[PDB]
Request: fold
Amino acid sequence: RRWLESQGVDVANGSNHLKLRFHGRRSVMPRHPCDEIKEPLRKAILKQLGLS
Amino acid sequence: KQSEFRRWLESQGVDVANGSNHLKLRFHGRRSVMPRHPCDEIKEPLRKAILKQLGLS
Amino acid sequence: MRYPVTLTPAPEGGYMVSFVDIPEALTQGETVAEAMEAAKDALLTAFDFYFEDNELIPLPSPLNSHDHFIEVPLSVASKVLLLNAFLQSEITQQELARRIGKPKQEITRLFNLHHATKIDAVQLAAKALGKELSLVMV
Amino acid sequence: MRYPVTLTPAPEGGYMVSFVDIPEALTQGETVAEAMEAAKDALLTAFDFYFEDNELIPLPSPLNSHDHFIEVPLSVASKVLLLNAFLQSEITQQELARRIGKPKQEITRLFNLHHATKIDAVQLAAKALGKELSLVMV
Reply:
């Protein structure tokens, strides 16, 4: 989770799930920093944010 | 005229309930509403519909 | 929910307002506009009787073209539907509150129109009654 | 309105939550009961994007027997439907305000999920949009 919230994607407004937008592409994910973030989440998220 | 019509209703034992919309009339298990415009004339078919609805035929 | 309104010309002028589905809703107006505005207030007012006496509220007759009608606000329509489902279940208000996980006080205020309506609360109470409230877009 | 949730279990021990209709709505949870709780939170959040970006929200695919699903509250479903009607009418937010007779400030928060929804306001906004919002069952 330190890696996920970093370069490129913009982490803007939100309350529960974070709303991350990347130059016209959109995705959410949980915040909960101490739980383990799953790889299938990371692939769905990176795919949602880097294809049209 | 509506003012006196409601006074007559009250003469006859009809209960006029508190409110801020139409007046709520109850009489021996029967119920009807009625405008809350005491200075308006009660129109004849309305006055007759209410008496019929309330059991005052 | 749209109740058809009967606008009857008065020989003295203006109109008498009646509702074929709601016998209590009786009022008047000097013009069609005044009559329809009074029609809505008279219909909504008459609904109080049914909540108070715990009686089913008759649902609207189907519209016929050229009908005058009053479209009832969703805040009211939701509670009309809730009241009919509650009465037909014959369970108590205390049991309904037990099922929802809310105190009776909040269940009681669902059965009166002189409050704001929180639509999700009506939806949960309907669910506890084995009923399902849905929204329809056109 | 019920969104079917796809939950693909990850070998790491638990489940991963997906929604076939909402690509932004992505999360997971470690148990079945827990993963569905996160599902509601994730989907409701994903809705915010579309209100922000003034684009159509995809309505749920029809349910198949034995589907997991999140039932969206009426409070959310009403404005989800409101957003879609606003866009396809191509009316301005200011033009909608004149037809509603309310100032821009209260029309704005119709198209936002982070405030209480007053169902009559949504119904009235739908009417001005040429849409008809009604409640069924219960």
About this structure: Chain B has one domain: 1-57. Chains B and A do not touch (no CB pair under 8 Å). The CA atoms of residues 45 and 51 of chain B lie 10 Å apart.
